[PDB]
Amino acid sequence: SKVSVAPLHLESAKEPPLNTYKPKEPFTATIVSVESLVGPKAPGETCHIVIDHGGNVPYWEGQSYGVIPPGENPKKPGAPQNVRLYSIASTRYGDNFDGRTGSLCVRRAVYYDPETGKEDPSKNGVCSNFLCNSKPGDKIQLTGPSGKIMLLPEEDPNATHIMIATGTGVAPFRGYLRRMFMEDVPNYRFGGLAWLFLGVANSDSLLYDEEFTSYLKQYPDNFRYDKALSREQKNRSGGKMYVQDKIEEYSDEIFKLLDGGAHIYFCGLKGMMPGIQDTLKKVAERRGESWDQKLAQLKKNKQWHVEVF
Ligand SMILES: Cc1cc2nc3c(=O)[nH]c(=O)nc-3n(C[C@H](O)[C@H](O)[C@H](O)COP(=O)(O)OP(=O)(O)OC[C@H]3O[C@@H](n4cnc5c(N)ncnc54)[C@H](O)[C@@H]3O)c2cc1C
Numbered sequence: 009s010k011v012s013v014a015p016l017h018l019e020s021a022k023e024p025p026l027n028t029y030k031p032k033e034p035f036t037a038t039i040v041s042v043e044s045l046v047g048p049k050a051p052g053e054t055c056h057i058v059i060d061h062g063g064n065v066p067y068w069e070g071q072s073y074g075v076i077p078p079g080e081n082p083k084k085p086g087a088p089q090n091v092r093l094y095s096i097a098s099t100r101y102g103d104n105f106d107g108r109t110g111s112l113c114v115r116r117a118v119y120y121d122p123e124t125g126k127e128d129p130s131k132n133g134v135c136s137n138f139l140c141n142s143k144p145g146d147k148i149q150l151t152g153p154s155g156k157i158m159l160l161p162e163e164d165p166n167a168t169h170i171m172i173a174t175g176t177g178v179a180p181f182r183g184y185l186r187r188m189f190m191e192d193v194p195n196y197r198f199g200g201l202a203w204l205f206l207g208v209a210n211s212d213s214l215l216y217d218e219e220f221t222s223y224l225k226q227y228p229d230n231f232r233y234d235k236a237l238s239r240e241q242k243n244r245s246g247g248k249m250y251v252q253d254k255i256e257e258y259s260d261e262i263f264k265l266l267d268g269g270a271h272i273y274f275c276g277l278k279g280m281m282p283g284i285q286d287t288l289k290k291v292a293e294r295r296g297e298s299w300d301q302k303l304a305q306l307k308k309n310k311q312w313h314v315e316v317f
Pocket residue numbers: 072092093094095096113114115116117118119130131132133134135136137176177179315317
């Protein structure tokens with residue numbers, strides 16, 4: 009049932025790779041495919057991009073690639089564009105199970121005049137649209153990989169991993185979960201609990217939903233999956249249903265799991281964290297506990313993993 013992956017020597021490295029390529033001399037990779045992940049009612053396009061790096065830019069799950077879009081620095085004429093980082097959405101073996109490709113999950117950044125709604129492409133995001141406009145065979149300047157915060161702790165193969173995502177923040181967790189449930193990795197047999205919370209605008213904006221629902225069916229005792237559809241569901245107080253409200257619904261069992269040593273991960277909108285904090289704070293305090301002190305402990309114990317942007 010698990011998918012054969014190759015080559016097994018990608019397991020050999022003792023330490024994550026870091027900054028194998030830097031902006032001064034990037035790696036010229038090649039697009040394999042680009043597809044929309046969303047339906048017509050989504051507020052914007054998010055695309056899945058598969059990139060052939062030829063085995064020249066390996067990474068571990070949870071890392072990022074940098075992309076240098078073409079053109080010159082608009083601020084610094086006679087200079088290349090700055091790097092944009094993207095969370096890698098694939099396992100180290102990639103979507104072709106062969107160790108040659110990695111994938112990105114990219115939301116197009118588009119500008120709309122606040123009053124008239126007139127879109128203005130001159131104010132669109134350069135790199136996000138460059139990527140989702142890409143076609144098979146196009147060349148892309150890759151840097152990295154980078155990142156350590158979102159590496160998956162594998163010391164306990166029966167650990168609990170609580171994953172909190174908004175939008176493209178799902179990307180690392182797609183990689184985690186394929187490694188946990190889909191790929192045949194003899195040196196990592198996951199037997200714990202993986203719990204994905206995902207916040208997106210509506211049903212049409214769901215990302216990789218089919219893949220996650222399949223894990224629910226295959227591994228009902230090791231995978232849980234909750235969704236906050238902000239524009240189709242209301243929280244208990246009449247506002248938009250956000251991931252922190254879903255967390256609140258399970259506040260007692262999330263705290264027990266954290267108390268038990270669970271890892272908790274946050275990726276996506278930086279603006280979600282104050283509400284998640286608020287929500288975790290209330291639970292700690294009703295128990296008689298300082299959240300300030302508890303959060304400090306969770307970080308000291310290396311249980312708290314944040315990459316928001
Ligand atoms: C660690 C990390 C991981 C990340 N992972 C992901 C990911 O998985 N997926 C993802 O989609 N993004 C991710 N990002 C964000 C990503 O790096 C980019 O910042 C994002 O794609 C936008 O870059 P851009 O080049 O498209 O926009 P930019 O060209 O950098 O422009 C930024 C914004 O300014 C707006 N803008 C430009 N000109 C004007 C103007 N005149 N008036 C008004 N507005 C203007 C653009 O519309 C855009 O929204 C991540 C960021 C970090 C730090």
